[PDB]
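Need the bound structure for zinc ion, inputs here:
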Amino acid sequence: MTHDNKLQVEAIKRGTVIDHIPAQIGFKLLSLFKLTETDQRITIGLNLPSGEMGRKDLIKIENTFLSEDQVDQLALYAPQATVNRIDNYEVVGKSRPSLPERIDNVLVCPNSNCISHAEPVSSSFAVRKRANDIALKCKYCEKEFSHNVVLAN
Amino acid sequence: MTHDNKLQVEAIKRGTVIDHIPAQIGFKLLSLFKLTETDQRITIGLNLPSGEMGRKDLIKIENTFLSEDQVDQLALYAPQATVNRIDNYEVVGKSRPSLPERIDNVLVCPNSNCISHAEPVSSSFAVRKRANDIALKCKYCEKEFSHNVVLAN
Amino acid sequence: ANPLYQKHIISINDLSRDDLNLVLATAAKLKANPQPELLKHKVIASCFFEASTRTRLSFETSMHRLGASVVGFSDSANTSLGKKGETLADTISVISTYVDAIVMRHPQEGAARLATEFSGNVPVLNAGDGSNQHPTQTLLDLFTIQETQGRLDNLHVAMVGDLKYGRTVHSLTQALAKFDGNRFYFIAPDALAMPQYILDMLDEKGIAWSLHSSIEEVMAEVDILYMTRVQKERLDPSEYANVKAQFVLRASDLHNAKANMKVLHPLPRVDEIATDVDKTPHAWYFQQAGNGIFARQALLALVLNRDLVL
Amino acid sequence: ANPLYQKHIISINDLSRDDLNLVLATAAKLKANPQPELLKHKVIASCFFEASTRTRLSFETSMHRLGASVVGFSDSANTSLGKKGETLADTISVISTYVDAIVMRHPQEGAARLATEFSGNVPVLNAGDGSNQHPTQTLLDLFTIQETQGRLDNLHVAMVGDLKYGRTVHSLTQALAKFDGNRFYFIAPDALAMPQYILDMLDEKGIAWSLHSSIEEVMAEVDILYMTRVQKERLDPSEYANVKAQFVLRASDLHNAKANMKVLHPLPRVDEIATDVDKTPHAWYFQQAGNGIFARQALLALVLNRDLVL
Amino acid sequence: ANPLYQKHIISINDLSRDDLNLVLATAAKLKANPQPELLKHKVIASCFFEASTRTRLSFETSMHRLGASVVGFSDSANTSLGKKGETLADTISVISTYVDAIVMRHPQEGAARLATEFSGNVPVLNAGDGSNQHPTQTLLDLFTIQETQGRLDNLHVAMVGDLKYGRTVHSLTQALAKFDGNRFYFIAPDALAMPQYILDMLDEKGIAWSLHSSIEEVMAEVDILYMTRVQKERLDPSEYANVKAQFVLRASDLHNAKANMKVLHPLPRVDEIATDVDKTPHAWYFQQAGNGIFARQALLALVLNRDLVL
Amino acid sequence: ANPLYQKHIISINDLSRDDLNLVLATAAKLKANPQPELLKHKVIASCFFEASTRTRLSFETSMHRLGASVVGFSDSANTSLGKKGETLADTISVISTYVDAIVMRHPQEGAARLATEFSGNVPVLNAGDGSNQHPTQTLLDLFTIQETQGRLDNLHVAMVGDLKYGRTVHSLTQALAKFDGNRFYFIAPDALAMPQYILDMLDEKGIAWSLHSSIEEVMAEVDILYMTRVQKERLDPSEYANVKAQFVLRASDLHNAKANMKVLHPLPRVDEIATDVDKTPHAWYFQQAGNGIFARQALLALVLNRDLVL
Ligand SMILES: Nc1ccn([C@@H]2O[C@H](COP(=O)(O)OP(=O)(O)OP(=O)(O)O)[C@@H](O)[C@H]2O)c(=O)n1
Ligand SMILES: Nc1ccn([C@@H]2O[C@H](COP(=O)(O)OP(=O)(O)OP(=O)(O)O)[C@@H](O)[C@H]2O)c(=O)n1
Ligand SMILES: [Zn+2]
Ligand SMILES: [Zn+2]
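Answer from helper R.:
Posting the output first, comments after.
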């Protein structure tokens, strides 16, 4: 009951709970994936105690089932986040993020001469787990970068 | 430790609660005022069911007391809000924003020949004319614009 | 022989309603069955003393689609003409000695009409003379209103933007006044207002016009919404940005537009029409640019041909 | 319909071996029986936002040898496009409204591929995008190796020069790796070495390569010696001149070259190949430039034609 | 120390009537009894990131008539600082370790104010920043109005030309609205009229102003006529030549002026003031430019010297 | 007379440790007790055939804080000398009849040394000659290392950036290798690393050096961090953005630095040093530019005065 855990729980009826967001990726995820552009109830918890994985973040989005592709996208940021759907008051599927085929939109080409900078284009990178790292190839300039060069910028 | 629920989520032990945030301005406020960079537990309710606007937003920042000048930077975006200050589960303080005289950092001078665009200075605007409708004067180029316009971009 | 045979297309004020309708019915035919060798063996000069890429590429492609050869220059970037002290009267007396029509753009107003005094009977088609005229841009605009609206009279046409310096809003207002019952709405910042001589000519013809400050006052009634670019050089940085930057169309503003409403813009659009307007069925600026091919083809066909059998 | 019908030729990594062989067998036919009116009535745009004379004259002559009309501009010398703030997406949405294919060169990498998102179904053929690709230079090179060597597999190909920045050695290495049993020798000054991503892709495909410091180590074994120009700006005056200026071929070095060995160079050659090499039967750089006519003709024929009967 | 000792001089808005009077009092003493070694051993930097020859030379001559040394630059297509990447803030941070005061003119507004945050305790004096401020011009106009009229209050000041964009006329009205009883006449083309902000301020203080159409209308009542130049860029050539029969000044027009009336112009006076005005007694624009020396000597002497006993 | 009296200052290689110490001793005296009329009546010529605003202004301010007069020029697309045909030798031969000393910056290496053969007995001081020497920068860096660290020997000096082409880092290593016990850490992109000549010299003297990969690796041991800028011309944009996660400095990285550790940069610092470094105690690049004044005053005073008693 108490060893505090929940306190008066935000137990939602239908929705998605993204849990174990690594701390500080919680806000990135809302910005980047434009999750607050909805009229449905969201409750976000930042820097939760979770002694069991130190601290973490957690977003609860009601009557929303963000999935498959949408879930895999988060792989680059919160590699271990367990998305959970809920249909009538309990977990009806925990889903883990898998690294996707492509990452569109949310990412920037390092290449300053890449045409994607001045144009009405949505960025697009091809993902390749070059065992050790993840290399990201730009659709347009076709230049390949470490995912850490891209995620800094 | 008190009966949370989530429709009007309960009790932090000491910290700030900015409540009666208009709707869709709550995340604007977490972004602009960088409220997120604490390791403190933040709890946030989004598109919530009551405080008479119908829907409202709410942020809870435990252990942080942000005040008086901070509360007033909130005035252009969320002037209807109440900032509750809490100690030992009681609202020992409850205030509202009021127009400041200066709004630093958050705005962008709409005048493209202003020097503030390219340089390691923070934007700064002098404010004037309460509720009939606010004019903001850039510190640097000394052009006075309608808040409507700076707040557009 | 058709009325335009071997005429100079210098100004819109010189073309009658009948002249306008003949060009526009011919553009409609060439759009429907091509005539790719009508101007076979004709050589045409494309003299753009002032560079204008959009306009030149369109004029030359229209010349190529009817089978004509093209020789000529784009300049404003010192390609030897005007050196020593060659007058324009002399340049044109030498170029009309071997080409069959001159299409020419020039920075000063009046240059195409003077070319006319020296070209013999090689016709001169004007592609822009300073702030004076641009017939071939009004012909394509008219063709696009006609083709999408089915008519050129009884229109509710809104003109938005810099109406004081926009060379094309001034001529399109003059041409639509050739026709009946059109109604004008002008929406311009105060410093960029539609000049008196337009307004006076409208009043004298009994045509209705009114000024509005936002597009949403008139969206519901409008058929053609013709947008213009404000040139920031015409204002200062701060004026442009201050309140006056709201002559910008977004998709959300089209909410209640009539199903037939079309948005036109001679181009470059830089930011007065936002990118999301493109996905709406009302965006017709690019289809307007494509229609410049048929209106320019029709004028070249009508001017170089005695009798045009279709 | 042939596989290339109405495709965009943006990158070499998008063309398969079969795609490469189809273009190259078509170039061989057009070189043998001309088809000077295959593209009759087609109008093509030659947009070189970055000037490149060699490449433009070749592309347009190939368009002229199949009967197409050409409109367009060479720029990098302020000819009005890009003014106001016209995006490239908008320039291409207006130019594809009246031309049947766009050949375009541009300074930023990725520009041809973005043109593709806006051209409707007018095909875009890339003539160079910054330091990224140049398919039509790799197609002509391949055609010249094929035509002189009889094959594209089992070759011993040496690449000499600036291998780090040379846009064409990088793509030719990628295309020859589509084929079997080729062996690479890279001879480059240390600062101008062949980047890892090439080397890594070669290693992963089981293809053999080795680095050498002089050409005489490998002359005897070599079939195609592909020379590059070192740009002196990429080094300082003294570095260029110091020991590193020995990636220069003279006639005397060819002593023991196989009778079949050919020297290729995309050009301008300034001094990496001395003038006396020209009189040798191994000099094939100019005959390589002439072969750009047939490889560019073949791509235009294959892209604009459903069925190509020969 | 004096009120302005080690103070930054950036906006006229920032200086009270008393400061303005302190400056004008000192400038009259420095004109009377020169002090050539007052700033002996000071090095001032004359950083003109925007070339202005008359303002640069008036300032360097001020620096040198008080004995100071000068290092600096001007810039059209030249001289490395700024470049790109070099921020104004790092230029200032570096130059403020070398000099004792910085006079700077720059094209973007607030450049002088940004500078103030990086110069340390080195005073920064603004010589022009875009369309915002130019206080050393306002100070010399006021000195010229004070020595010709004897006071700075109860004047009938007529301002003429481009009131919308002359930065000098905006400043002068602000400054004269700190003295009492002044009546203002504003003769502008309505395309180029006083901004409502100048006008809104003048009404909160109760100052009387009126808008007129031609100088002939106010000639008889006026003590200062401050002409400004009309920017023919901001105007269509045909509009420019259309306005009434101009607002240019000729001696015929002065046949009515008060004996003590003077014509001022910040210069250049290209064609709004004819040559015959130059020989009337009412012409005072060159004497106005000579007083530039005394005004900028006063400001420099007060900023760099604690107490000045003259 | 002093050792450097009437001596030419061309290469750091040409001055022994004792000369370097003489200069740094004098500069500390001139910083302490100014001597404003020391070069009273000398005229120095500031011949910048290559524009460098920060180096020109530091030098002219040096000239003037010792009382000298200055004649000279700078040159981008301007100012007649050289032209073509006018040899540098005849420019010097003529200017050395007018002035008492020549400070010159020129784009070709050895221009200052060629000058020395034509100036007569007029001393020539080098302010930059291509990629060869810039001794007055090395002298101010050493002054800055001496006043922050207290010595010029037994230092742990980390050098970062384009070690292959920063002329300042080549000079600084030469000069610091005349003092004893210094340990060198070189953090460069391997495309931009220390030439083997600097490295070969350092080993003949027994000096310890090591090559590292990122500053985070040496942060804890280092007394001077000398950052250099990375020339993005010498690099492909995609390489430039690829290296590790750069070698740029931010305050987070300094959390480990020694209390007396300082960051130096010859400037400009465009993006290799973030703004937050500016407020740490370890930031010393602007104070380093202020010491430029004291270093060049010392060199001028010693060259032009026989005995200096200060
Ligand atoms: N009616 C419900 C049911 C579940 N949850 C949320 O869904 C998540 C699912 O976790 P669960 O499988 O129920 O137990 P956990 O051990 O927390 O899951 P995990 O092992 O992934 O951490 C929990 O964070 C819980 O808040 C909820 O808000 N409302
Ligand atoms: N320890 C506590 C006590 C109160 N609250 C929050 O404090 C806010 C407002 O405080 P309160 O004055 O107690 O409720 P109201 O009277 O409704 O305040 P107001 O009238 O301004 O809405 C409520 O949103 C409630 O969630 C809280 O989170 N933690
Ligand atoms: Zn890219
Ligand atoms: Zn501003």
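Comments: The pocket of zinc ion (ligand 3) is lined by residues A 109, 111, 114, 116, 138, 140-141, 143; D 110 (CB under 6 Å). Residues 49 and 63 of chain A are 26 Å apart (CA to CA).
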